[PDB]
Design a protein around this ligand. Structure first.
Ligand SMILES: Cc1c(-c2cc3cc(Nc4cc5n(n4)CC(=O)N(C(C)C)CC5)ncc3c(N)c2F)cnc2c1NCCO2
Length: 264
């Protein structure tokens, strides 16, 4: 409050209470997230956030003022991939490929720290001005969006049991999302989507157009969208997949996309 100047509410309830702020001593842009009772318990949860990955939005500081918690993070100028594709349209196969590798690297770190993101979706993958892909590491708000749920997460509403492998399924849905501007079954009732997953003969989703994509992209979708969690590969195993281990994958693919965002 006394060090930063608030400028713009970001998310519109999607993120919660996020603010685009400017430092009075640096002038640099930051993201301030306000979280809705004890003093000693609050200072313990912050210390663990400073100990930091290339594909994770970096922590800056925390502020406990008048019953409000101010989580400070880095500002990704372009916003989320969803904000980007609402202007640029669908991403190229190589753009999606690079985005998947970067998300998979962030998930490898998160899952190694015994954490589960649980919300991997287009609107939760941020792209900074530098063309870098970053995820966010954080009675409470139920985390999860029906269309991006793994079958073991949807079924959890009857016969519980899920693990870090759900983020692999969510990344699979997000790959289809970045290609078709909508997840599979976006047009179908969320209970019906999460009900058809719980029935026999269930077929995991694929890209609508077969001819528009390569067999490696089609295999990445087949492999990440494995119905069985036991057979679904780990984030590190996925990193060696033909699609995300291609040689042309560089940050420039996103500097191209960010240029289309500026002037299409
Ligand atoms: C990802 C996340 C965050 C989170 C968000 C951030 C956003 C940014 N920058 C930007 C830049 C923009 N937008 N956002 C979106 C946006 O509204 N517009 C508007 C102006 C149309 C376009 C330009 N920068 C940093 C962020 C950061 N660190 C965060 F943690 C907080 N809470 C969460 C989640 N996940 C789901 C629920 O909880």
């Amino acid at each position: 409050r006394d060090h930063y100047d608030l400028l713009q509410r970001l998310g519109g309830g999607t993120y919660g209470e996020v603010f685009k702020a400017r430092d009075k001593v640096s002038g640099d842009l930051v993201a301030l997230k306000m979280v809705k009772d004890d003093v000693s318990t609050l200072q313990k949860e912050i210390l663990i956030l400073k100990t930091r990955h290339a594909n994770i939005v970096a922590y800056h500081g925390s502020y406990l003022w008048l019953q409000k918690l101010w989580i400070c993070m880095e500002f990704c100028g372009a916003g989320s991939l969803q904000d980007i594709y609402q202007v640029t349209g669908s991403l190229s196969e190589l753009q999606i490929s690079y985005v998947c590798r970067e998300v998979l690297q962030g998930l490898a770190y998160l899952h190694s720290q015994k954490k589960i993101h649980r919300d991997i979706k287009g609107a939760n993958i941020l792209i900074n001005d530098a063309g870098e892909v970053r995820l966010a590491d954080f009675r409470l708000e139920f985390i999860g969006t029906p269309y991006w749920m793994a079958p073991e997460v949807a079924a959890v509403a009857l016969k519980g049991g899920y693990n870090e492998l759900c983020d692999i399924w969510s990344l699979g849905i997000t790959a289809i999302e970045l290609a078709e501007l909508q997840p599979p079954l976006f047009d179908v009732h969320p209970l019906r989507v999460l009900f058809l997953m719980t029935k026999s003969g269930y077929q995991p989703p694929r890209l609508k157009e077969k001819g528009k994509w390569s067999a490696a992209f089609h295999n990445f979708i087949k492999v990440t969208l494995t119905k069985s969690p036991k057979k679904r590969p780990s984030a590190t195993k996925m990193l060696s997949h033909q699609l995300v281990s291609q040689p042309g994958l560089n940050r420039g693919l996103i500097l191209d996309l960010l240029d289309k965002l500026k002037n299409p």
